[PDB]
Amino acid sequence: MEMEKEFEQIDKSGSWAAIYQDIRHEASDFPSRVAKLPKNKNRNRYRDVSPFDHSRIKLHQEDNDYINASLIKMEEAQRSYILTQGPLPNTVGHFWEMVWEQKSRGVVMLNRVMEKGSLKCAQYWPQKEEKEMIFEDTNLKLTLISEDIKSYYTVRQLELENLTTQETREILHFHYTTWPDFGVPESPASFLNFLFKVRESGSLSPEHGPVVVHCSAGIGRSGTFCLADTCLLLMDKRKDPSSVDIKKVLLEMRKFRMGLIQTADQLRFSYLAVIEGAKFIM
Ligand SMILES: CCC(=O)Nc1nc(C)cs1
Ligand SMILES: CCC(=O)Nc1nc(C)cs1
Numbered sequence: 001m002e003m004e005k006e007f008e009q010i011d012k013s014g015s016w017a018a019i020y021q022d023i024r025h026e027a028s029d030f031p032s033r034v035a036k037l038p039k040n041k042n043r044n045r046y047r048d049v050s051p052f053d054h055s056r057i058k059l060h061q062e063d064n065d066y067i068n069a070s071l072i073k074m075e076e077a078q079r080s081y082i083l084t085q086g087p088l089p090n091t092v093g094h095f096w097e098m099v100w101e102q103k104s105r106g107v108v109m110l111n112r113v114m115e116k117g118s119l120k121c122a123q124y125w126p127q128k129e130e131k132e133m134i135f136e137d138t139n140l141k142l143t144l145i146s147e148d149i150k151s152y153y154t155v156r157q158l159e160l161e162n163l164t165t166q167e168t169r170e171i172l173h174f175h176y177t178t179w180p181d182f183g184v185p186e187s188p189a190s191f192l193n194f195l196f197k198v199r200e201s202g203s204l205s206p207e208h209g210p211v212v213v214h215c216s217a218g219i220g221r222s223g224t225f226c227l228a229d230t231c232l233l234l235m236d237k238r239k240d241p242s243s244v245d246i247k248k249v250l251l252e253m254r255k256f257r258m259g260l261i262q263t264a265d266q267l268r269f270s271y272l273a274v275i276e277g278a279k280f281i282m
C-alpha cells in the first residue's frame with residue numbers, strides 16, 4: 001500500500017502495536033559473540049543491546065578492537081551510517097578513535113546528557129574553547145572551536161587532533177536538544193528541519209566517511225533518524241515514489257543492527273516524518 005493512506009488505515013483501526021510486533025518477529029537474528037566476551041562488559045551500556053559480529057565497527061588496535069557500534073550500509077540509497085550507543089566514562093577515547101579512523105565528518109546526538117534524572121551518556125566534548133580535552137588512552141586532543149545554539153538544536157565546530165601524527169580535522173557536532181523525556185514529538189517539523197541541516201553540512205555525503213549517530217542505546221531515536229533519511233532519499237531516486245515501503249526499509253536496516261525503532265510510537269512518528277518530509281522536498 002502507499003504510505004499516507006496505510007497510515008490513516010492503521011490510525012483508524014488502532015493497530016500500531018500489532019504492526020510493530022510483526023516487525024519484531026520478522027527481524028534478523030545474527031550472532032554478537034564479541035560483544036558478550038567478559039572483557040567487554042564495561043564497554044556496553046545495556047546488556048540487551050549489542051552489535052552483530054558481521055557489521056560491527058572494529059577499532060584499529062591489537063589489544064581490544066571492540067566498540068558498541070554498527071555499520072548500516074544502504075545499497076540502493078547509496079548511504080551509510082554508523083549507529084552507536086552514547087559513550088560511557090571508559091569509552092570516550094574509543095568513540096573519538098572511531099570517528100578518526102572511519103573519516104567521519106559529522107556526529108549526530110539525539111539525547112541530552114541527563115534525562116529523567118539519570119545520566120544517559122558521558123560529557124564527551126568540551127564546553128569551553130579554552131578547556132580542551134585530551135584522551136590519553138587513544139592519543140587524541142579535542143577542542144571546541146565555535147557553538148551555535150538554536151531553539152531546537154545546537155551545532156558545534158570541533159577540532160580533532162591525532163597527537164601521534166599532528167594531523168588535524170574539523171568535526172561537526174549536530175545536537176538535537178528537544179526530544180521529550182517521554183514519548184515522541186507531537187510534530188515532526190523540528191526533527192525534519194534538523195535532518196536537513198545535517199544534510200546541508202556535507203556530513204552525510206559520499207566524499208566523507210559515514211556519519212556517527214547516537215542516542216542512549218543507539219537504536220531508538222537513532223533508528224528514526226536514519227530510517228527517515230533513507231526513505232526520503234529513495235523517494236527522490238525512484239520513478240514511482242509511492243513504491244517506497246517503510247516497513248521493508250526498516251527490516252533491511254535491522255539486518256545490520258538489532259532493535260532499530262524501540263516502540264510503536266516511534267514507528268508511527270517515523271511514518272509521520274517521511275509523509276510530511278515528502279511534501280516539502282517538492
Ligand atoms: C595497530 C593494530 C591494528 O589493529 N591496526 C589496524 N590497521 C587497520 C587498517 C585495521 S586494524
Ligand atoms: C557553527 C558550526 C557550524 O554550524 N558549521 C557549519 N558548517 C556548515 C558547512 C554548515 S553548518
Ligand SMILES: CCC(=O)Nc1nc(C)cs1
Binds near residue numbers: 016264
Ligand atoms: C501506539 C502508538 C499510537 O497508537 N499512537 C497514536 N497517536 C494517535 C494520535 C493515534 S494512535
